[PDB]
Each structure stands twice: as C-alpha cells, then as structure tokens.
Scaffold this active site. Structure first.
Site, short mmCIF file in Angstrom:
data_model
loop_
_atom_site.label_atom_id
_atom_site.label_comp_id
_atom_site.label_asym_id
_atom_site.label_seq_id
_atom_site.Cartn_x
_atom_site.Cartn_y
_atom_site.Cartn_z
N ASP A 168 35.16 9.02 70.66
CA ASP A 168 34.05 9.91 70.31
C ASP A 168 32.74 9.38 70.90
OD1 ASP A 168 32.72 12.06 69.21
OD2 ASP A 168 33.05 11.46 67.11
N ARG A 186 25.11 11.48 70.76
CA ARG A 186 24.90 11.60 69.31
C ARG A 186 25.51 10.43 68.56
NH1 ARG A 186 28.93 15.08 70.66
NH2 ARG A 186 31.02 14.49 69.89
N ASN A 187 26.36 9.65 69.23
CA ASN A 187 26.98 8.51 68.58
C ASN A 187 26.56 7.15 69.16
OD1 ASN A 187 28.15 10.10 66.63
ND2 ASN A 187 30.13 10.33 67.71
N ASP A 201 29.50 5.35 65.01
CA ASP A 201 30.48 6.40 64.66
C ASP A 201 31.89 6.04 65.12
OD1 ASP A 201 31.88 8.63 63.86
OD2 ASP A 201 30.41 10.11 64.59
N1 LIG Z 1 22.78 2.63 61.56
C1 LIG Z 1 21.93 3.80 61.67
N2 LIG Z 1 20.60 3.62 61.73
C2 LIG Z 1 19.76 4.68 61.85
N3 LIG Z 1 20.25 5.95 61.90
C3 LIG Z 1 21.59 6.19 61.84
C4 LIG Z 1 22.47 5.09 61.71
N4 LIG Z 1 23.71 5.59 61.68
C5 LIG Z 1 23.66 6.92 61.76
N5 LIG Z 1 22.38 7.33 61.86
C6 LIG Z 1 21.93 8.65 61.96
O1 LIG Z 1 22.88 9.55 61.26
C7 LIG Z 1 23.45 10.41 62.32
C8 LIG Z 1 24.90 10.59 62.10
O2 LIG Z 1 25.54 9.33 62.10
P1 LIG Z 1 27.15 9.24 62.23
O3 LIG Z 1 27.62 9.62 63.65
O4 LIG Z 1 27.58 7.83 61.90
O5 LIG Z 1 27.79 10.22 61.17
P2 LIG Z 1 28.86 11.31 61.59
O6 LIG Z 1 28.67 11.74 63.09
O7 LIG Z 1 30.26 10.80 61.40
C9 LIG Z 1 28.52 12.68 60.42
P3 LIG Z 1 29.89 13.90 60.36
O8 LIG Z 1 31.28 13.20 60.47
O9 LIG Z 1 29.79 14.70 59.01
O10 LIG Z 1 29.70 14.88 61.50
C10 LIG Z 1 23.19 9.69 63.55
O11 LIG Z 1 23.19 10.55 64.69
C11 LIG Z 1 21.91 9.08 63.35
O12 LIG Z 1 20.84 10.03 63.58
MG LIG Z 2 28.63 10.97 64.89
MG LIG Z 3 32.02 11.51 61.25
#
Ligand SMILES: Nc1ncnc2c1ncn2[C@@H]1O[C@H](COP(=O)(O)OP(=O)(O)CP(=O)(O)O)[C@@H](O)[C@H]1O
Ligand SMILES: [Mg+2]
Ligand SMILES: [Mg+2]
Length: 293
Positions: free
Chosen positions: A155, A159-160, A173
């Site tokens: 992935d 965005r990650n 992520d």
């Molecule tokens: N360690 C961190 N510090 C600052 N911001 C963070 C962070 N981790 C995540 N974020 C913010 O939260 C957003 C989403 O993070 P993440 O990718 O880990 O969740 P996700 O993509 O699994 C949500 P979902 O599975 O519901 O779609 C990131 O794009 C970022 O903006």
């Molecule tokens: Mg993500």
């Molecule tokens: Mg996720």
C-alpha cells in the site's frame, strides 16, 4: 485480546488530543504519552494514536491488530514510521506511533503548489526539483530496508508516506503489509480493500505480491511526488484502467519531471517484475540523480 507487556502502555499514561487524519474505518489523533522516553527528567513524548472509528467492526479490529503486529517485527529505520507502544487492555485498541508533524506526503506536496500567474493565496516555501528527488530517495531507502526485513508493504502511496518537522519521509500504514519470510511471493486469498491505481498488473489478476510489485507502487508514488500530489490515471474508470495497463499504457511524464526520472519511473512499470529495478537499485539511481544536481 492477548497481552504483550513488552509493548503495552497503560492508557492512564495517555492524554488524547487534536485529530490528525483519518479514512473510512480508522482515525489518527495526536496525544501525549508518559513513560515512553527513558529520560524521566524532560517529558512527555508527543505521539500519534491510531484507533478504530465508531462504526468499525470486529474485522476492522483484527486488521488493526495484524497491522500492529506487522510493525512489531519490522525493526527501526529513519524512513519508517516508528511503533512506540500500544494500549490493548481494558478499552479500545490504540496503536501508538511516532508523530509526523507535517502530515502525509500528498497533502504536504499539495499545500506547496503555486497559485498560478496573476493569482495569490491569502493564508496558509516552494519545493525544488532537488527537494522532490530527496523525497523519492528517502522513501526508496525505507523500502529497501523493508524488503531486507522480508516484508512487503502492498500500500505504498503518497497518502501513506508521512513528513516530520525536519522534512524526513516516514513510510506508514502497514494495514496491507505481509510477512514474506520463507516465501517466494505472497498470494492474496481473501477479499478486502485494494489500492487499485497503485497495484502492479500481476498483483491485480494473479493476486501475487512481491518486492517487485512494491517497486511498481513506488513508480506510481514517484508520479505522485512530481505532480505535487496528483491523483493517478486521472479521469480513467478503474474497470478500464486495467485493459489499458495490459495494452502497455503507462502514465505520461509530469511537467516537473526530467527525462532521467521518467525513465526510472518507467523502469518500475515494466510488465515483467524481474525487469523492474530493485529498491537497492532505486536507491543507487536516485542517489546519482541527486549527487549531480
Ligand atoms: N504518525 C502520524 N503522525 C501525524 N499524522 C499521522 C500519523 N499517522 C497518520 N497520520 C495522519 O492520519 C492519516 C491516515 O493515517 P493511516 O494511513 O495510518 O490510516 P489509514 O490509511 O489506515 C485510515 P483507513 O484504513 O480507515 O482508510 C494520514 O494520512 C495522516 O494524515
Ligand atoms: Mg493510509
Ligand atoms: Mg487502514
């Protein structure tokens, strides 16, 4: 939910703060954590807490657990988001990770696009070609480490990738990450979210993932970086994206991108996975681009 004292941080040590970001089923919030730092004199560490949203299911929960467990085996690297601990006992599951102040890479790049001739923004430094290649180089370094840990990410996308106050890229992520130790490849056997526009052909129909399928994703990431947060295959319905990929269609060169980088990008997008560069090779080729600029 089985305890792991090694990583467990009692939730009384944790004060939840402002929202950082989120998606469909998970959210990440800023927090203060007491006891993480072994220097007791100056404290407490600011961390990011990833947790389930309120509509989340049991499946979302076991996926967050797996994600947490994957980060446990990975080992620490400058360009990989750091797991700091977890609250797994007597309450919602919180996954504690290193705080990246500047958010994700897509939003970081987007907030630095210029307004266009004759226009100005009214309320919030321009990136150079070098800044962007640096970004690519740092991610390639973390992916190189990740592959040496025998883990595939599956992935990798703007965005990650996260950005610290020092503009250090941190791959984040690990929701789709898989252990590829004593495996030639990983074979997906369930149904769940797929980041289609980032996936190599072989991953899309054979459901087969390797480090080489990660390299394909890196190529898409490169395109994201050099369009300053562009969205891949714009205007193309997914159902067709795939006939197009078979027919040898690849994305066009971004306007900021040089020829050398587009070739690097194009090598990642080879039809045969064995003809794509390794991440080690990617680190080399991007170091060169950067050494002479
Ligand atoms: N360690 C961190 N510090 C600052 N911001 C963070 C962070 N981790 C995540 N974020 C913010 O939260 C957003 C989403 O993070 P993440 O990718 O880990 O969740 P996700 O993509 O699994 C949500 P979902 O599975 O519901 O779609 C990131 O794009 C970022 O903006
Ligand atoms: Mg993500
Ligand atoms: Mg996720």
């Amino acid at each position: 939910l089985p305890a792991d004292p090694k990583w467990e941080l009692s939730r009384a040590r944790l004060t939840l703060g402002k929202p950082l970001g989120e998606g469909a089923f998970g959210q990440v919030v800023m927090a203060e954590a007491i006891g993480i730092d072994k220097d007791r004199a100056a404290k407490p560490v600011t961390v990011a807490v990833k947790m389930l949203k309120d509509d989340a299911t049991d499946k979302d929960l076991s996926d967050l657990v797996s994600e947490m467990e994957m980060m446990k085996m990975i080992g620490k690297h400058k360009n990989i988001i750091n797991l700091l601990g977890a609250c797994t006992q007597g309450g919602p599951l919180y996954v504690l990770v290193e705080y990246a102040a500047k958010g994700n890479l897509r939003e970081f790049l987007r907030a630095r696009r210029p307004p266009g001739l004759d226009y100005s923004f009214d309320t919030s430094e321009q990136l150079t070609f070098k800044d962007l290649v640096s970004c690519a180089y740092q991610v390639a370094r973390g992916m190189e480490y990740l592959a040496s840990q025998k883990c595939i990410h599956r992935d990798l996308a703007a965005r990650n990738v996260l950005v610290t106050e020092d503009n250090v890229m941190k791959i984040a992520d690990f929701g789709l990450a898989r252990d590829v130790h004593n495996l030639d490849y990983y074979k997906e056997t369930t149904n769940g979210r797929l980041p289609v526009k980032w996936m190599a052909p072989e991953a899309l129909f054979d459901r087969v993932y390797t480090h080489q399928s990660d390299v394909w994703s890196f190529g898409v990431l490169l395109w994201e970086i050099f369009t300053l947060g562009g969205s891949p295959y714009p205007g193309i319905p997914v159902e067709e994206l795939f006939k197009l990929l078979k027919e040898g269609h690849r994305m066009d060169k971004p306007a900021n991108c040089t020829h050398d980088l587009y070739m690097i990008m194009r090598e990642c997008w080879h039809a045969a996975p064995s003809q794509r560069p390794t991440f080690k090779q990617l680190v080399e080729d991007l170091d060169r681009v950067l050494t002479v600029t």
